[PDB]
């Protein structure tokens, strides 16, 4: 896997951003995570909702520099978002997000699934720590 350079252009909820990426506006769909949202039909906000969404809102706007790391297999889902890893000054926001409690590993579809065992390792930390969702 590689990491490439992309600017943010818009946050748009906790697990979808709009990116700058080379020289496309494209929204980003968080590989591997579940996040509530403030999106969604079958809720529309959902608890931890706008929570989730204003951590990744702070951690992408704040950051120096973004980068997007694909994965081994589909790079886009249905909607025609971009399937990534985002990392924000090197930290990867779809960890972050789960090592705080606030979203769970997602449904895993191989061969998208490079940094399964990682974010599920997070994931038993924050829900023995009881933060946020888990608590």
């Known amino acids: 896997l590689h990491k490439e350079p992309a600017t943010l252009i818009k946050a748009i909820d906790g697990d979808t951003v709009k990116l700058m990426y080379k020289g496309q506006p494209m929204t980003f769909r968080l590989l591997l995570v579940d996040v509530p ?6 809720k529309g906000v959902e608890k931890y909702g706008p929570e989730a969404s204003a951590f990744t809102k702070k951690m992408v706007e704040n950051a120096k520099k973004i980068e997007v790391e694909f994965d081994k297999g589909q790079r886009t889902d249905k909607y025609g978002r971009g399937l990534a890893y985002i990392y924000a000054d090197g930290k990867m926001v779809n960890e972050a997000l789960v090592r705080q409690g606030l979203a769970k590993v997602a449904y895993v579809y191989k061969p998208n699934n490079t940094h399964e065992q990682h974010l599920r390792k997070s994931e038993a930390q924050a829900k023995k720590e009881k933060l946020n969702i888990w608590s």
């Open 37 to 42: 949202e403030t999106k969604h039909p079958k």
